[PDB]
Amino acid sequence: MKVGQDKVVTIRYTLQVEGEVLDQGELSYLHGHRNLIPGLEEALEGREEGEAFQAHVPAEKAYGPHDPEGVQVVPLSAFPEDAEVVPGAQFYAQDMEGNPMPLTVVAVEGEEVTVDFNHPLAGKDLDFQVEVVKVREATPEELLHGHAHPSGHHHH
Amino acid sequence: AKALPFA
Ligand SMILES: [Cl-]
Ligand SMILES: [Mg+2]
Ligand code: NI
């Protein structure tokens, strides 16, 4: 069956950036409901089960460009006082209703921490290898919820 | 942003 609107699609993938494998895994997603980055959904459109291919997805069609406004300068106090607040460390801020917002520490100086709320892949072009494992129709429950049951990574 | 593969 071919990948198309309102199909639940299972893929196995490898993700490389700048020639370094960053991720491998398997996931299922409901196609046509902005569940996957757009360049990848476009590359999967109309593919047959069993197809395997490689695809280059520019940042613009993946996680977007890096947004300079996602870089903030925050007090070193907001971090645990035995925390390793260091370039590359990840932390989660929380907003007024408790939503976790992940950040990566960029720099530290004095009482100030430069942090980046951008997605870690923002601004990066992604090279995928993708295999279409299974395609099926969605159930009414899945179409009503806009996602698959189960919805995400089998393996990551 | 929350869209997968989400590496
Ligand atoms: Cl989904
Ligand atoms: Mg195989
Ligand atoms: Ni909310």
Numbering used by the authors:
A (entry chain A): 1 to 156
B (entry chain D): 6 to 12
Show sentences the authors wrote.
Peptidyl-prolyl isomerases (PPIases) catalyze intrinsically slow and often rate-limiting isomerization of prolyl-peptide bonds in unfolded or partially folded proteins, thereby speeding up the folding process and preventing misfolding. An example of such a protein is SlyD (Sensitive to Lysis D), which consists of an FKBP type PPIase domain and a chaperone domain, called IF (insert-in-flap) domain, that has been shown to exhibit chaperone activity.
Although most of the protein–peptide complexes did not crystallize or yielded crystals of poor diffraction quality, we succeeded in structure determination for four complexes of SlyDWT with bound substrates: psWT, W4A, W4K, and M8A. In all structures, the peptide substrates are bound in the PPIase binding pocket with the proline residue in cis conformation, coordinated by the previously observed protein–peptide polar interactions, namely N35-L9, I37-L9, Y63-F11, H119-F11 and Y92-F13. Although all peptide substrates bound to both SlyDWT domains in solution, the chaperone domains displayed no electron density for peptide substrates psWT and M8A in their respective crystal structures. The absence of these substrates in the high-affinity chaperone domains can be attributed to high dynamics of substrate binding and serendipitous blocking of the binding site by neighbouring molecule of SlyD in the crystal packing. Thus, the M8 side chain of the peptide substrate has an influence on the enzymatic activity of SlyD, which is not caused by a change in the overall binding mode of the peptide.
